[PDB]
Amino acid sequence: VSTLIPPKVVSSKNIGSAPNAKRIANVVHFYKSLPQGPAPAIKANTRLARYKAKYFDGDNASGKPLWHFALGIIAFGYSMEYYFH
Amino acid sequence: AKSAANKLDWAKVISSLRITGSTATQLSSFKKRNDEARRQLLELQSQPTEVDFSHY
């Protein structure tokens, strides 16, 4: 007898599976995606964007800024020692 | 041929395998196959309409 009409009806496979949710996510995310992100920090300029760039970038974490930062406070109180003495 | 109809039918039963929510479409198709097979055996069973009057 005469075949039923379901095989030629589709209209809820688009909620029917899980990658639909991911699809509607990644059509927004990827379509308006940039090839590369914006920045790993770069502001501190006054001849100190260089200080941050050399020391406090993702390029390295090394003891050089620590030494520098320590020395600033040492220079304050060391001069003040002779202001107190 | 009849084999075109039936090949497309059984191929479609196995396509209907690859789609769910169509669990009785194939059962209708099976019925169509049955009666198609029935009409050929109906036709082979046949007693020709005319009486035999040459010999009989």
From Swiss-Prot, chain A:
Intracellular or extracellular location(s): Mitochondrion; Mitochondrion inner membrane
Keywords assigned by UniProt, alphabetized: ATP synthesis, CF(0), Hydrogen ion transport, Ion transport, Membrane, Mitochondrion, Mitochondrion inner membrane, Transit peptide, Transport
GO terms (BP aspect): proton motive force-driven ATP synthesis; proton transmembrane transport
Annotated GO CC locations: mitochondrial inner membrane; mitochondrion; proton-transporting ATP synthase complex
Subunit structure: F-type ATPases have 2 components, CF(1) - the catalytic core - and CF(0) - the membrane proton channel. In yeast, the dimeric form of ATP synthase consists of 17 polypeptides: alpha, beta, gamma, delta, epsilon, 4 (B), 5 (OSCP), 6 (A), 8, 9 (C), d, E (Tim11), f, g, h, i/j and k.
Further information: Present with 14600 molecules/cell in log phase SD medium.
Function text: Mitochondrial membrane ATP synthase (F(1)F(0) ATP synthase or Complex V) produces ATP from ADP in the presence of a proton gradient across the membrane which is generated by electron transport complexes of the respiratory chain. F-type ATPases consist of two structural domains, F(1) - containing the extramembraneous catalytic core and F(0) - containing the membrane proton channel, linked together by a central stalk and a peripheral stalk. During catalysis, ATP synthesis in the catalytic domain of F(1) is coupled via a rotary mechanism of the central stalk subunits to proton translocation.
Family: Belongs to the ATPase F chain family.
Protein name: ATP synthase subunit f, mitochondrial
Taxonomic source organism: Saccharomyces cerevisiae (strain ATCC 204508 / S288c) (Baker's yeast)
Gene behind this protein: ATP17
Span within the parent record: 7 to 91 of 101
Curated annotation (Swiss-Prot), chain B:
Localization terms from the record: Mitochondrion; Mitochondrion inner membrane
Note: Present with 6820 molecules/cell in log phase SD medium.
Cited function: Mitochondrial membrane ATP synthase (F(1)F(0) ATP synthase or Complex V) produces ATP from ADP in the presence of a proton gradient across the membrane which is generated by electron transport complexes of the respiratory chain. F-type ATPases consist of two structural domains, F(1) - containing the extramembraneous catalytic core, and F(0) - containing the membrane proton channel, linked together by a central stalk and a peripheral stalk. During catalysis, ATP synthesis in the catalytic domain of F(1) is coupled via a rotary mechanism of the central stalk subunits to proton translocation.
Quaternary data: F-type ATPases have 2 components, CF(1) - the catalytic core - and CF(0) - the membrane proton channel. In yeast, the dimeric form of ATP synthase consists of 17 polypeptides: alpha, beta, gamma, delta, epsilon, 4 (B), 5 (OSCP), 6 (A), 8, 9 (C), d, E (Tim11), f, g, h, i/j and k.
Protein family: Belongs to the ATPase d subunit family.
Stated name of the protein: ATP synthase subunit d, mitochondrial
Naturally occurring in which organism (per UniProt): Saccharomyces cerevisiae (strain ATCC 204508 / S288c)
Gene: ATP7
